[PDB]
Design an enzyme around this catalytic site. Structure first.
Site, PDB file in Angstrom:
ATOM      1  N   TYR A  49      42.381  35.320  39.915  1.00 20.96           N
ATOM      2  CA  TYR A  49      41.337  34.106  40.319  1.00 20.96           C
ATOM      3  C   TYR A  49      40.990  33.830  38.449  1.00 20.96           C
ATOM      4  O   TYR A  49      39.444  33.128  39.231  1.00 20.96           O
ATOM      5  CB  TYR A  49      40.682  33.653  41.998  1.00 20.96           C
ATOM      6  N   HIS A  50      41.779  33.903  37.877  1.00 17.26           N
ATOM      7  CA  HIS A  50      40.755  33.327  36.519  1.00 17.26           C
ATOM      8  C   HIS A  50      42.386  33.191  35.612  1.00 17.26           C
ATOM      9  O   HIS A  50      43.186  33.485  35.802  1.00 17.26           O
ATOM     10  CB  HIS A  50      40.187  34.556  35.830  1.00 17.26           C
ATOM     11  N   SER A  51      41.974  32.654  34.478  1.00 15.08           N
ATOM     12  CA  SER A  51      42.282  32.666  32.985  1.00 15.08           C
ATOM     13  C   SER A  51      41.444  32.665  32.406  1.00 15.08           C
ATOM     14  O   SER A  51      40.385  33.071  32.698  1.00 15.08           O
ATOM     15  CB  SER A  51      43.373  31.247  33.413  1.00 15.08           C
TER      16      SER A  51
END
Ligand SMILES: C[C@H](O)COCC(COC[C@@H](C)O)(COC[C@@H](C)O)COC[C@@H](C)O
Ligand SMILES: Cc1cn([C@H]2C[C@H](O)[C@@H](CO)O2)c(=O)[nH]c1=O
Ligand SMILES: Cc1cn([C@H]2C[C@H](O)[C@@H](CO)O2)c(=O)[nH]c1=O
Lengths: 136, 138
Positions: A49-51
């Site tokens: 759940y990240h960039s």
């Protein structure tokens, strides 16, 4: 779609088993400033759940299997990694989630910079806002 | 007595999402990572390794299962079992090593301070011993 690649590594296999080497700037396009690895993840769990805006990474499943859901604006692919001699390159502004970690799964990540919270995008709305300016 | 070796403890981030261990060059280990390699699918009856180096620094980590590392210098030998992903085995110059008892599913990761240099890979045991006796023997 954009900003992702599968990279093939050498796999030296003989009676002593298998070995894959990765040298920074040669087998991957960047120097390895940081590595981390993820183990013992329960089968029903989704993580990630990240960039990021600036980081380049390569993800490699060294045992078992794990599924990586890669998103950019208007686009989504699921890639199953299950071979230690294949890396998943992920460049900037791709959002990722990982799931279906198997029993004994090991996911190794090589990263092009030291950890910098200011470049970890954890809020999907902020992601979408930044990413639609790049991809759209 | 066993010189040029250490156990290094890493952060283990454990929560409902699983475990993660991060290793940053020069921070969690004393050198920059120029190279990594990993060993998988080793048959249970195999011993591999049989080498040393003069200039290379490495950290070995067993990311799944268990594996035994036989370390030796002149007059000394120890065997260390690696079975925790948050623990690394640092091995400095002129330590001879062999690895064995890889369990089913074992994964051994090595972080290395230099690119591969065949000239620093000491494979001759007699040469190893000669060089190492000069370092370690008083
Ligand atoms: C069923 C439910 O638990 C799913 O969580 C959705 C969610 C997905 O985030 C990115 C998504 C891919 O677009 C929540 O997002 C909804 C709005 C707020 O962006 C994941 O929840 C985030 C936790 C798990 O860290
Ligand atoms: C350990 C290692 C071995 N090798 C090659 C050289 C060795 O002679 C050979 C062992 O089969 O593998 C590499 O190319 N890169 C590496 O990092
Ligand atoms: C991916 C990664 C996370 N982390 C930790 C720091 C963050 O505070 C935490 C997420 O809350 O993850 C590291 O310390 N190093 C890393 O390389």
């Amino acid at each position: 779609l954009y900003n992702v690649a599968l990279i093939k590594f050498k796999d030296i296999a003989d009676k002593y088993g298998h070995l894959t080497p990765i040298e920074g700037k040669i087998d991957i396009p960047f120097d390895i400033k940081r590595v981390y690895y993820i183990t013992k993840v329960d089968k029903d769990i989704t993580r990630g759940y990240h960039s990021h805006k600036k980081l380049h990474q390569v993800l490699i499943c060294l045992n078992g299997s794990v599924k990586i859901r890669l998103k950019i604006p208007d686009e989504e692919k699921i890639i199953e990694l299950n071979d230690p001699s294949v890396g998943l390159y992920i460049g900037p502004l791709v959002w990722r989630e990982m799931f279906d970690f198997t029993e004994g799964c090991v996911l190794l990540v090589l990263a092009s910079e030291y950890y910098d919270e200011t470049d970890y995008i954890r809020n999907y709305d902020f992601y979408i806002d930044e990413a639609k300016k790049r991809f759209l």
